[PDB]
Design an enzyme around this catalytic site. Structure first.
Site, short mmCIF file in Angstrom:
data_model
loop_
_atom_site.label_atom_id
_atom_site.label_comp_id
_atom_site.label_asym_id
_atom_site.label_seq_id
_atom_site.Cartn_x
_atom_site.Cartn_y
_atom_site.Cartn_z
N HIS A 191 5.88 1.45 -3.86
CA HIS A 191 5.69 2.13 -2.50
C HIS A 191 5.25 3.71 -2.75
CE1 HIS A 191 6.29 3.08 1.83
NE2 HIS A 191 6.50 4.19 1.42
N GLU A 192 6.00 4.45 -3.71
CA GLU A 192 5.74 5.83 -3.79
C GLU A 192 4.49 6.08 -4.58
OE1 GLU A 192 7.61 7.55 -2.00
OE2 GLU A 192 9.02 6.07 -1.62
N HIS A 238 1.65 5.65 -2.41
CA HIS A 238 1.34 6.82 -1.73
C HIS A 238 0.09 7.90 -2.33
CE1 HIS A 238 3.49 6.75 2.08
NE2 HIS A 238 4.77 6.87 1.53
N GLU A 285 2.36 4.44 5.45
CA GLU A 285 3.40 3.90 5.05
C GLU A 285 3.41 2.22 4.97
OE1 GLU A 285 5.99 5.33 3.97
OE2 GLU A 285 5.50 7.21 4.41
N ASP A 309 3.58 -0.04 1.76
CA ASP A 309 4.40 -1.01 1.70
C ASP A 309 3.73 -2.57 1.15
OD1 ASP A 309 6.78 0.06 2.72
OD2 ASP A 309 6.26 -0.61 4.96
N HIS A 345 6.73 5.66 9.71
CA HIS A 345 7.09 4.13 9.08
C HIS A 345 7.11 3.24 10.22
CE1 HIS A 345 9.51 7.23 6.33
NE2 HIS A 345 8.94 6.14 5.52
N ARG A 397 8.12 -3.91 9.30
CA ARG A 397 7.78 -3.84 7.63
C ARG A 397 8.00 -5.14 7.03
NH1 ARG A 397 10.40 2.06 5.68
NH2 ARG A 397 8.82 1.85 4.25
ZN LIG Z 1 6.42 6.09 2.11
#
Ligand SMILES: [Zn+2]
Ligand SMILES: *[C@@H]1O[C@H](CO)[C@@H](O)[C@H](O)[C@H]1NC(C)=O
Ligand SMILES: *[C@@H]1O[C@H](CO)[C@@H](O)[C@H](O)[C@H]1NC(C)=O
Ligand SMILES: *[C@@H]1O[C@H](CO)[C@@H](O)[C@H](O)[C@H]1NC(C)=O
Ligand SMILES: *[C@@H]1O[C@H](CO)[C@@H](O)[C@H](O)[C@H]1NC(C)=O
Length: 696
Positions: free
Chosen positions: A530-531, A534, A593, A597, A658, A664
């Protein structure tokens, strides 16, 4: 052939307790993974949301309370100061006996609060200018109203700082609240009532006469002004393109292009900037470059601010600051804030004082509290296990580039360059534990009095703002961490091109060095992906390997990014949230986000398959009729178990970038073929639609 270790037993019990195996996973994987947790749990009266993240944060606050509440002989000065700050915060007797006197002392320094001041025009309105009044709240107290001027990182030269001008944050959670009808009506009523109640308390404490109709008059005009400001601000959907948001111009050009008449005086941008920057002995001339994030806002401001007096403006300006300070005052003052929070967030009780205080000390002394936290609660050897998982997932990201059909080769090569450059920060900066000198020096200029909580919080405000302003002519510290260690979260910094996994998130269910790898990859692995993802979402893709805003996409690939990601805009924008009364998620504001995900889960899964290829299948978990590919997805979903109060659900639809945890879960798994394989989902069952979105 079943794992019977203590660490497998604790994991399996958690998985079993939280899931509801009577739900079919291909119909609603949220209720399958979280239904048992939802049944057992109720949202605390003090919270507007509850679930896995919120529970771990509550449990982290317990650790913080344990370490802050006992002084120790060995404590270095940095640690003595955090504990002293904590003790000043939890002493409600000292706080209560001061009433509102610490705020009353402060109000002259910000040109007063007219509604609670007799003869404001004679006392303050005489020497009042918008330049001086806005700057004073900005420079001394870090409170930015009407015109948000701040020193930050230059998006196009990430080693330097530059002055920015932007629209201000509002009193209510978002610009949408200022319609003040339907689902926003009670919030708007509570907001003006909050204003009135605080004005009344201050007047009562100053022994001024209370005229309820005049209070209602002045505070409704505060709302009327702020409604105009709110409507003049750009929506988040018009601020999500960082190339379009960035506009560099000189102060001379700003004066030419964004003139303002306030209280009948021509607004001098150079005098406003110098009123701020002189606070740290920095002089500004009209050739200074400035990044203007909200040119349209400044333009719409012009007809707004000719309609209002100095007194009208100062009533809003002082209120916005006073709103932030009420919780540092006596219980009588907090009671007015408690009433507004109920109306706004649905909570019926104020957070425990020790929890608010622990979090406050953590937010303001993140490295000192981080040292105490990791020494009490963090293994240390796990730092290296996480290092290696990041290595694996970063490599999975780069390999996947080859298989993507919507990028050309030059763009894939630049994407690989950026991915290789990502700096990683795991757990905590070692020197917060081993370098006492550096840690003490971070807080050297702070000195707390244990009976002066309010004075202490004002000191933190001054100290932090002055430090930020002083960065204008300095380079960015590349050694600095973008989060403290005692944090249950993970982050990506586009400006530093850096992923951060604080120690607070490196625990079950995300991670344990002794739990099954299927769980680690489904937990912290997915967070790692996830990071990383980004750096490549609708914001991060615009920044290169050094964190500079530069276009490294070909026209076709950039166009194709938009095509691929538009799929998810429609997908999540089509979700209806019952907790929010059926309102739809914002598919644009949550796109980044959601991209993270969906990309992150796939990267983590492929890393786990690689792991199995190189090491073989893991022992199954006792009590669960699931294989490890199923457990991977079960643990991913259980990371996001939770639920929301209705009031906060409509809040978060407008303010949270988010998606809610349950979408999610549904959204990303709907888009995952590998999930439907793991659970043998029939074609076009709810969790397995034929159309699936994919970016990364
Ligand atoms: Zn995030
Ligand atoms: C709280 O502050 C008051 C006033 O200084 C003091 O008398 C009292 O001892 C303090 N309580 C604690 C627990 O420190
Ligand atoms: C908001 O401002 C726009 C122009 O900036 C105007 O067209 C619109 O009527 C305003 N909205 C309200 C509710 O006044
Ligand atoms: C800004 O202008 C005011 C006049 O309203 C003047 O008194 C003040 O010294 C000026 N400040 C700076 C920093 O130029
Ligand atoms: C729902 O999906 C359809 C087609 O996929 C799309 O046209 C529509 O804009 C979506 N609705 C929202 C609110 O995003």
């Amino acid at each position: 052939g079943i794992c019977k270790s203590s660490d497998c037993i604790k994991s399996a019990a958690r998985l079993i307790q939280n899931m509801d195996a009577t739900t079919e996973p291909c119909t609603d994987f949220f209720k399958y993974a979280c239904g048992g947790w939802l049944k057992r749990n109720v949202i605390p009266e003090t919270s507007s949301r509850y679930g896995n993240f919120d529970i771990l944060r509550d449990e982290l606050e317990v650790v913080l309370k344990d370490v802050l509440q006992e002084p120790k002989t060995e404590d270095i000065v940095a640690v003595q100061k955090a504990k002293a700050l904590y003790r000043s915060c939890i002493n409600e007797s000292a706080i209560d006996s001061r009433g509102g006197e610490p705020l009353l002392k402060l109000l002259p320094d910000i040109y007063g609060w007219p509604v609670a001041t007799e003869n404001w025009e004679q006392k303050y309105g005489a020497s009042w200018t918008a330049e001086k009044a806005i700057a004073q709240l900005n420079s001394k107290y870090g409170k930015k109203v009407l015109i948000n001027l701040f020193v930050g990182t230059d998006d196009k030269n990430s080693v330097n700082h530059v002055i920015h001008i932007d629209q201000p944050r509002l009193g209510l959670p978002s610009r949408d609240y200022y319609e003040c009808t339907g689902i926003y009506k009670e919030a708007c009523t509570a907001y003006v009532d909050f204003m009135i109640s605080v004005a009344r308390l201050i007047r009562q404490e100053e022994r001024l006469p209370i005229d309820e109709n005049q209070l209602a008059l002045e505070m409704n005009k505060v709302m009327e002004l702020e409604k105009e400001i709110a409507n003049a601000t750009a929506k988040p959907e018009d601020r999500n393109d960082p190339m379009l948001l960035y506009n560099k111009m000189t102060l001379a050009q700003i004066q030419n292009n964004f003139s303002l008449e306030i209280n009948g005086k021509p607004f001098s941008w150079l005098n406003f900037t110098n009123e701020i920057m002189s606070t740290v002995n920095i002089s500004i001339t009209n050739e200074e470059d400035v990044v203007v994030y909200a040119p349209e806002y400044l333009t719409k401001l012009k007809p707004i601010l000719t309609k209002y007096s100095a007194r009208d403006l100062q009533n809003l300006m002082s209120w916005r600051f006073i709103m932030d300070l009420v919780s540092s005052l006596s219980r009588t003052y907090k009671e007015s804030r408690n009433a507004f929070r109920k109306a706004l967030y649905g909570t019926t009780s104020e957070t425990a004082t020790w929890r608010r205080c622990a979090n406050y000390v953590n937010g303001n002394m993140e490295n000192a509290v981080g040292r105490l936290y990791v020494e009490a609660a963090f293994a240390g050897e796990s730092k290296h296990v996480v290092e290696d998982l990041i290595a694996q997932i970063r490599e999975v990201f780069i390999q996947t580039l080859d298989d993507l059909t919507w990028m050309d080769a030059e763009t894939k090569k630049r994407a690989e360059e950026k991915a290789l450059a990502i700096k990683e920060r795991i757990g905590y900066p070692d020197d917060i534990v081993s370098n006492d000198n550096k840690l003490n020096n971070e807080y050297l200029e702070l000195n707390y009095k244990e009976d002066e909580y309010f004075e202490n919080i004002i000191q933190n405000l001054k100290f932090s703002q002055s430090k930020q302003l002083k960065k204008l002519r300095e380079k960015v510290d590349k050694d600095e961490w973008i989060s403290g260690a005692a944090v249950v979260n993970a982050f990506y910094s586009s400006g530093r091109n850096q992923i951060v996994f604080p120690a607070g998130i490196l625990q079950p269910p995300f991670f344990s060095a002794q739990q099954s790898n299927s769980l680690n990859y489904g937990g912290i692995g997915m967070v790692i992906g996830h990071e990383i993802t980004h750096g490549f979402d609708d914001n991060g893709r615009n920044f290169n390997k050094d964190g500079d805003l530069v276009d490294w996409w070909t026209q076709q690939s950039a166009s194709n990014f938009k095509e691929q990601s538009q799929c998810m805009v429609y997908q999540y924008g089509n979700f209806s949230w019952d907790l929010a009364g059926g309102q739809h998620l914002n598919g644009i504001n949550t796109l980044g986000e959601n991209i993270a995900d969906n990309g992150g889960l796939g990267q983590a899964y492929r890393a786990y398959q690689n792991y199995i290829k190189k090491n073989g299948e893991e022992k199954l978990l006792p009590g669960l009729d699931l294989n490890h590919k199923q457990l991977f997805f079960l643990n991913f979903a259980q990371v996001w178990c939770g639920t929301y109060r209705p009031e906060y659900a409509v809040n978060s639809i407008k303010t949270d970038v988010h998606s809610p945890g349950n979408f999610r879960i549904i959204g990303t798994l709907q888009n995952s073929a590998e999930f439907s394989e793991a659970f043998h989902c029939r074609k076009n069952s709810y969790m397995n639609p034929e159309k699936k979105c994919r970016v990364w």
